[PDB]
Each structure stands twice: as C-alpha cells, then as structure tokens.
Amino acid sequence: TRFHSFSFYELKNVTNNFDERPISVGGNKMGEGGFGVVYKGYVNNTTVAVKKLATTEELKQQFDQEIKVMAKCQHENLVELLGFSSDGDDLCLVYVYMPNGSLLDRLSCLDGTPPLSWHMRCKIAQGAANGINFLHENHHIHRDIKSANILLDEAFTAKISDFGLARASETVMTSRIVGTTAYMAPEALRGEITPKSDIYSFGVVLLEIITGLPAVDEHREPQLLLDIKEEIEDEEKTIEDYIDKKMNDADSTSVEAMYSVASQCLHEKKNKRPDIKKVQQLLQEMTA
Numbered sequence: 001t002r003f004h005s006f007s008f009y010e011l012k013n014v015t016n017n018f019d020e021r022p023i024s025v026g027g028n029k030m031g032e033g034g035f036g037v038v039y040k041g042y043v044n045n046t047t048v049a050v051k052k053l054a055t056t057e058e059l060k061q062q063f064d065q066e067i068k069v070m071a072k073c074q075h076e077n078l079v080e081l082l083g084f085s086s087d088g089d090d091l092c093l094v095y096v097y098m099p100n101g102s103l104l105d106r107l108s109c110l111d112g113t114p115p116l117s118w119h120m121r122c123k124i125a126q127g128a129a130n131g132i133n134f135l136h137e138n139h140h141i142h143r144d145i146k147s148a149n150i151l152l153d154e155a156f157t158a159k160i161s162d163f164g165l166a167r168a169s170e171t172v173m174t175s176r177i178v179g180t181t182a183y184m185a186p187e188a189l190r191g192e193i194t195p196k197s198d199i200y201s202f203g204v205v206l207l208e209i210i211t212g213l214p215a216v217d218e219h220r221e222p223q224l225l226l227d228i229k230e231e232i233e234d235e236e237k238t239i240e241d242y243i244d245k246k247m248n249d250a251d252s253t254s255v256e257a258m259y260s261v262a263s264q265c266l267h268e269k270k271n272k273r274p275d276i277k278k279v280q281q282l283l284q285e286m287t288a
C-alpha cells in the first residue's frame with residue numbers, strides 16, 4: 001500500500017501556518033507530544049489531522065518507521081495515514097481526522113466534553129485490543145501504548161496511533177530506552193523489546209478506562225495508577241472504590257471482568273501475562 005505525496009505549503013496553508021492556539025479561541029493545535037505536534041486542517045474536500053515532527057536523524061527514522069508500518073498495516077482500529085510531506089523544512093504525516101480526539105482527553109473530559117459511558121468504554125477497550133492484535137499478528141511491537149495514543153473517531157471507535165518507535169519480530173535489547181514511564185513494563189524500562197510489554201501498557205490503559213484517573217498524577221496517592229492493583233490484591237480497597245463516578249451504566253460484573261483482564265495484563269513477570277489474542281477473547285466475553 002502507498003500514499004500521496006503532499007506539498008509542505010499545502011499543509012502549511014490548510015493548518016493556518018501550523019497555528020499553536022487551541023480550536024475554541026481560533027487556532028489549529030490539537031495535541032502535542034508524540035515526537036511531533038498534531039494540527040487541524042481541511043484538504044481535498046475533507047477534515048484532516050497533520051502531524052508535524054519536531055536527534056534530527058533519529059526523528060526521520062521515526063517518520064520512516066510510521067510510514068513503513070502504515071503501508072504494511074491497514075485496520076479499522078488503527079489511525080489512517082492519507083499521505084506525508086518531506087519537501088519542506090519539517091516532516092509531516094497526514095491522517096484522517098478523528099473528531100473525538102484522544103482517549104486521555106475523553107477520560108478527563110477536557111474542554112467540557114461529556115464523560116464516556118461504560119458502554120462506550122467497553123467498545124473502546126475491545127477496539128483497542130483488536131488494533132494491538134493486528135500489530136502483533138503482523139509482527140510489530142508498538143512500544144508506546146497509552147490513552148493519549150488511542151484516538152476516537154466519529155462513532156467512538158478506538159484507533160491506535162504513533163508507530164514511530166515500533167519494532168519488528170519476524171527478545172531484543174536496547175541502550176535507547178523510549179516510552180512513557182507510567183505505562184512502561186519493568187523489562188521495557190530496563191531495555192528489553194518484546195510484545196509482552198505492549199500487554200502490560202494496555203493493562204494501565206484498562207485501569208484508566210475503569211477509573212477515569214490518569215496513569216500518573218503528581219498530587220495523588222498512589223501517584224502511579226498501576227499501584228492500585230496491589231491495594232486491591234492486598235485487600236485494603238476493592239475495584240468498586242476506584243470505579244469512575246462519572247458513569248451511570250457501569251455494572252459491577254462487567255467492570256470486575258475488565259479489571260480481571262487488566263490485573264492479568266499487569267503481571268510483573270512478562271511470561272505470566274496473557275498474549276493479545278487472549279486479552280481480545282476475555283474482552284469479547286465481558287460484553288456477552
């Protein structure tokens with residue numbers, strides 16, 4: 001699969017010269033981080049997301065890795081790359097716009113958006129697991145599974161994004177440790193590169209979905225969301241004490257069933273964790 005070659009100046013024009021202001025005030029910046037900034041634009045009679053990236057040589061390796069992975073990977077639970085740009089000063093990746101933004105923003109109700117229902121959340125959890133399943137089936141390790149890298153389309157379908165740090169398989173080691181600390185598996189923090197780390201990170205995402213709490217909060221106890229698994233196991237608290245209060249359709253059974261999947265995902269011994277196909281099965285059984 002191949003993609004259109006966009007002109008830098010077409011992208012610069014449709015994104016109002018890559019404006020840093022939010023959409024409400026009258027700007028174009030949508031999200032920042034992800035080794036680049038995502039801006040809003042309207043090209044070829046449609047709304048698009050333009051990622052401007054942004055060591056300069058390692059940044060283009062992340063640009064080339066994302067196109068390589070997208071040429072090879074087309075799925076309904078992955079973001080859709082429409083084209084790219086190299087001719088300008090900066091590097092750009094053009095995607096199909098995901099109107100509902102990131103799961104992180106939707107879980108925090110950024111800008112006053114209504115809280116996601118449990119029904120919506122089960123659908124997102126299932127969809128996200130289908131996207132990771134597709135990557136693992138095609139021998140790709142994401143390396144940065146987190147709620148800020150799961151996007152939501154017009155119908156709240158989960159779309160996995162950011163494949164710049166992706167790795168093939170088709171256990172490796174590296175001196176360049178990359179990812180988001182609060183989501184990373186112990187071995188991933190040590191340099192190991194394995195698809196088992198993606199499962200651990202997906203367990204943190206399932207806890208964010210259940211609780212609505214961010215993976216890391218400086219002004220909180222525990223500051224790291226993954227530590228609640230121990231509070232529940234060493235029966236001081238229970239999962240009901242952590243369920244997101246911003247839901248009226250969350251029954252205890254299905255929540256506990258999602259938590260069970262998260263608990264299994266968050267096993268510290270990488271070999272004890274389930275593979276993605278099992279995570280996928282258990283999430284399907286939860287609804288059904």
Ligand SMILES: Cn1cc(NC(=O)c2cnn3ccc(N4CCNCC4)nc23)c(C(N)=O)n1
Binds near residue numbers: 049051
């Ligand atoms: C409403 N709306 C649409 C958005 N962003 C998008 O529609 C979007 C489309 N493809 N894609 C690929 C990656 C990406 N980001 C990677 C880094 N983490 C943030 C997401 N965002 C997008 C956003 C956003 N916050 O990026 N908000």
